[PDB]
Each structure stands twice: as C-alpha cells, then as structure tokens.
Amino acid sequence: PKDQEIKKLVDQNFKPLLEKYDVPGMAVGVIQNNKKYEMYYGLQSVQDKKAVNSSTIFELGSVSKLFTATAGAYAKNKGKISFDDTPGKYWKELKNTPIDQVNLLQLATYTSGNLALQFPDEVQTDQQVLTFFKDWKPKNPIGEYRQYSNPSIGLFGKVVALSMNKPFDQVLEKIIFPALGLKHSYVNVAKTQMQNYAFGYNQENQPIRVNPGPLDAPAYGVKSTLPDMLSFIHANLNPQKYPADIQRAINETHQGRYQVNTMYQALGWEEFSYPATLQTLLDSNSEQIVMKPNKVTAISKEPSVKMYHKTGSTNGFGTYVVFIPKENIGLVMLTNKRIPNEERIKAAYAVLNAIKK
C-alpha cells in the first residue's frame, strides 16, 4: 500500500538509473512514518549470479565518515575527549608538534588549514603516517578554511580510538555498531560474510573492491547492508529511542559547526535549512565545495528546521543517505557501481518529496 506506492516511486526515480549507468546492483531503502521499506535490484555479483538482497554488504565510501563522527561524539559525551583537545594529548608522538595546535573538532570538520583530500601516494605504512603528521606545518589559519579531507577525519578517528583504548575497527564493531542496532556492518568484513560482500564494478564492469590505505577505516572503510543503514537512519530520526550515550552522540552529530554558503558543516553530516531547494543540495557536492579550500563563516543562528545528507563512493560503489527530522522521513541508496552524485541527490529529492505529508 504505502509499500506499493514507495516501490512505485523508487521504480520511477531510481530504477531508470540502472540502465542509464549500467549499474549491476542496487538497494534503496526508505523510512517514513516510522516504517522501513527495502527495495532491491540486480546482482551483487555478476560472475556468481547472486542477486542483491537484504544480506548484501556494500562499501559506503565517505558515508563511513558518519560513523567516525558518531564514534567521536560518543567518546566526547562519555568524557573520553573534549573537542577542544589537540591530537598530541592522545597520540603522544605528536605532542608539541604543529598539528598539535589543531583541535579535534577542527580535524573532524576539515579546518586544519593544510590537509588535502588524500594522503600523498607515498604515505602507506603506520610509520609513514605518523611521520606525515610529525612533519606537518600549517598553511592557512587554523579553523578558517574548509578542505574536505581523508587525512583530517582519519586523524580524528585515530585519536578517538586512542581515547577509548581500542583500535578504531573495534570501536565501531564492538561499541558503536551494536549501540545503533547494526548487525552486519564492518570495517573488516567477517570471514563468514564474504559470500554476502558485493563486488563493486568499474566502468568496464570489471569487479573490484576497496584497497587498503592510510587511515582508511575512519575515512572510507566501512561496509554495510541496507537494513543496517535504514537502522542508522532510524537512529538519526529518533535518537531519544536509544541509550543515553549513543543518543547524546547522535544528537551531537547534528549540531552545525560553521557555515559555507547554504551548507552547514555538522559532524560527518552536511546540514541545510529545511525546506531546501534541490539546487542547494546539489551545490553541496560542487567541485568548489568538495575539492578546494573554502572560507567558513561562524554560525550566528542555526536553522530551527533542518535536513542532512551525505554522499560517498569507493571506486566500485556509490552511497547516498538523507533524512529530515521534521517530516520523519529518510532514504538510503547503495549501488555496486558509481553513479553521478547529482543523480543520487535528484532521485532522492523526488522520492522524498512525493512521500511528504
């Protein structure tokens, strides 16, 4: 009923992308009015003729950053860290180095003022990563400029892990994932679940999966299922229904920290005044916003009514997650091939618009 109507909306707005971009497989979830709806298309593995289904595990890419943010907020609300702390309080070899002038909130929200999108090619081992951060020097004034960055939020996740005395994979797999009711989400996919891990596909439909990299886990290294991600949206829409420490942490991730044009940077999540135009949501993934440094403006008044989203990709996968508290709706799309972010944003906008009360 609503089942049929939503499936119809998804068939009209997401299904055509499968042909347009030759996508072998897709899971789209919608949560609305307190009910979850799971829609699956295609194959998780072309060679094995395995269909995408409720157990299929996808690479979330940068949507991993949401879990990193949630982990840090959890740490902070437990008094394990303060966001005014610097990384050398926790990772002692960086004590009294220049990166130790940048605080944990600034690493989380990409404002160190000299951290690019990726580590250089040459930084691969734990030691080379430690060395990179020892040798780091400032460029822009700390806190002034947003530059979307894996090394920035990776360094944040690493110190969060230190503050909890667990490697970061265990922070998520042992504490945060279960706290959010997630059952099949992973930093390292369990042995007994490899049969469920999709292959991703490149534009020649060669099957691929994410390779290891420096501080990968906190930046882009989580994998999950459609039901788990719909649980995660449910948690974002209803933090009050969770235990205090995870509840506090979820609420903390929604707090906007500074503004760039019409986007507010929260923890991991991007935040907008709601109702938001499509163009506002598209502009959030502009080359200028994603690839270049941008001067931030301090928030004077946060919007009283908001919505949040996050895009992510690995070479073989696309993810998009969106929720609007006031409408009590959300959506997740997972694909095992990249499709343009703007198509993900537009498709979701149409479906959410159609189901608003």
From TrEMBL:
Catalysed reactions, as listed in the record: a beta-lactam + H2O = a substituted beta-amino acid
Keyword Hydrolase: yes or no? yes
One term under GO cellular component: outer membrane-bounded periplasmic space
The UniProt keywords, alphabetically, are: Antibiotic resistance, Hydrolase, Signal
Q: Which residues form a coiled coil?
A: none
Residue limits of the Beta-lactamase-related domain? 10-354
Enzyme type, top EC level: hydrolase
- Which Gene3D superfamilies does the entry mention? DD-peptidase/beta-lactamase superfamily
PANTHER family (alphabetical): BETA-LACTAMASE-RELATED, D-ALANYL-D-ALANINE-CARBOXYPEPTIDASE/ENDOPEPTIDASE AMPH
Q: Which family does it belong to?
A: Belongs to the class-C beta-lactamase family.
Protein's recorded name: Beta-lactamase
This protein's species is Acinetobacter baumannii
